[PDB]
Design a protein around this ligand. Structure first.
Ligand SMILES: O=C(O)CNC(=O)C(=O)O
Ligand SMILES: [Mg+2]
Ligand code: NI
Ligand SMILES: [Zn+2]
Length: 331
């Protein structure tokens, strides 16, 4: 078995190897990459997402989210308070303000310490889940706006044609902005490209050990657990590495820098934070290996997680028994 310790793998494809996305994903899995839940892909040196970032300041963040924390430093929840719209230029200036900027630090490890010690005492503002793309239309390789669609994968594998579309999303982050412990909708893959700015630190639990993280989460967030049988789908709970280590939960960590791709694998729980002002683009995708994960994916039926038009069809086709109760939560 390849990669039996489930370490995060880092790949350096040549420009030749960067032509066929599906094939490269299948290569990484041949080497065991999915066992970690997360992989880093460093693009060929010749490749670029676009020529410059010089004209992005007029993108609108219609609903910036202020991430307010409750709990203790290593075990907390966050709620998103909606703020007034602002442009990317306005947001960048805010991120660079004395109130919100990254503190002085020695290296990524010191910064990680400061994040876990101090996150809960601040409320950074995240420009998340903005439909759009920063890839130039002429970028042919690993263009997250030109990927094969999940609906087309389901059609190719299963023969059934369904409605729905699959488009990317932009994330504008600042120091301390946080992504809570989650897997993707329908336990899909995700791919995330860090277009610009400061790094993003990731934590991940191997898919084979996801239920260990779920059991810990039920113990640490016991009211949330009683409220919903899949409450990590709400994307609100944080657990620190120290706490995970105290409870024997297998995980790994890695820092993504600008210009790098990360891939999350089906049922790979992940969480993390941004080091400073940055812009990431991400999208879900599927492969044939995903289908079985999609059929087994948990679902939020309490009604909090409230998810896309396109997830309807996935549930309807892969999870027909759940169908019914799940759409009661989404209507
Ligand atoms: O970048 C973020 O805030 C969150 N991204 C992801 O969870 C992802 O790409 O799957
Ligand atoms: Mg602009
Ligand atoms: Ni994710
Ligand atoms: Zn729920």
């Amino acid at each position: 078995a390849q990669n039996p310790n489930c370490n995060i793998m880092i790949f350096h494809p040549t420009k030749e190897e960067f032509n066929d996305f599906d094939k490269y994903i299948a290569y990484m899995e041949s080497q065991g990459a999915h066992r970690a839940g997360l992989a880093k892909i460093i693009p060929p040196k010749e490749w670029k997402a676009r020529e410059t970032y010089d004209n992005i300041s007029e993108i609108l963040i219609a609903t910036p989210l202020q991430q307010v924390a409750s709990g203790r430093a290593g075990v907390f929840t966050q709620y998103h308070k909606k703020k007034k719209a602002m442009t990317v230029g306005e947001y960048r200036h805010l991120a660079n303000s004395k109130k919100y900027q990254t503190p002085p630090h020695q290296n990524f490890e010191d910064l990680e310490r400061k994040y876990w010690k101090n996150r809960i005492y601040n409320s950074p503002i995240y420009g998340a889940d903005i439909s759009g793309s920063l890839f130039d239309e002429n970028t042919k390789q690993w263009n997250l706006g030109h990927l094969g669609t999940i609906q087309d994968l389901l059609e190719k594998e299963c023969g059934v044609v369904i409605e729905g579309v699959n488009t990317p999303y932009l994330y504008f982050g600042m120091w301390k902005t946080t992504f809570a412990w989650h897997t993707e909708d329908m336990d899909l893959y995700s791919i995330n490209y860090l277009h610009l700015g400061e790094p993003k630190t990731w934590y991940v639990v191997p898919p084979e050990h996801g239920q260990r993280l779920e059991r810990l989460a039920r113990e640490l967030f016991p009211g949330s657990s009683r409220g919903c049988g899949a409450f990590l789908r709400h994307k609100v709970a944080l657990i620190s590495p120290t706490v995970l280590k105290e409870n024997g939960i297998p995980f790994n960590r890695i820092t993504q820098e600008a210009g790098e791709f990360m891939v999350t694998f089906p049922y790979g729980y992940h969480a993390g934070f941004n080091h400073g002002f940055n812009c990431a683009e991400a999208i879900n995708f599927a492969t044939p290996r995903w289908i079985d994960y999609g059929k087994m994916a948990s679902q939020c039926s309490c009604g909090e997680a409230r998810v896309t038009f396109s997830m309807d069809a996935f549930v309807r086709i892969l999870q027909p028994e759940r169908y019914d109760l799940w759409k009661r939560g989404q209507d």
